Amino acid sequence: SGEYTEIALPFSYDGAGEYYWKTDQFSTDPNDWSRYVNSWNLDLLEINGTDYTNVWVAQHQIPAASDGYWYIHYKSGVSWGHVEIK
């Protein structure tokens, strides 16, 4: 199903583009405040089919998928659009 490319942390992309990636590397640990995630310029950002583009989130806040992965969607909107996943 889909087209999920595998990505390793810390990761980043830039410029407008629609994408879908997968990772097995989120920290589960509530003291790992340095392993956080943020965006704003992106038009749409989702984990496992549910949106988080409006906010920051910590990797230890995000529940895993049915197989134990995290799957991450991204979308085009602006030519200077940045992101980073810690």
What does this molecule look like?
This is cellulase. Belongs to the glycosyl hydrolase 5 (cellulase A) family. It comes from Winmispira thermophila (strain ATCC 49972 / DSM 6192 / RI 19.B1). With 86 residues, the chain is mostly beta strands. The protein has one domain (1-86). It contains no helices and 9 strands. It has strands at 5-6, 11-14, 19-23, 36-38, 45-47, 50-51, 57-58, 70-74, 82-85. The radius of gyration is 12 Å and the shape is globular.
Concise structural overview:
The chain is mainly beta and 86 residues long. The chain is 0% helix and 35% strand.
Strand order of the largest sheet: 1-3-8-5-6
Number of domains: 1
Structural category is mainly beta
Strand content: 25-35%
As a whole number of angstroms, the C-alpha radius of gyration is 12 Å
Give me the strand/helix succession: EEEEEEEEE
Distance between the termini: 26 Å
Residue share in helix = under 10%
Number of helices: 0
Tertiary shape:
globular
* Beta strand count: 9
The main sheet comes to:
5 strands, mixed
Helix and strand topology:
Elements: E1 5-6, E2 11-14, E3 19-23, E4 36-38, E5 45-47, E6 50-51, E7 57-58, E8 70-74, E9 82-85
Parallel strand pairs: 1-3
Antiparallel strand pairs: 2-9, 3-8, 4-7, 4-9, 5-6, 5-8
Organism: Winmispira thermophila (strain ATCC 49972 / DSM 6192 / RI 19.B1) (Spirochaeta thermophila)
Domain Carbohydrate-binding module: 4-86
Protein name: cellulase
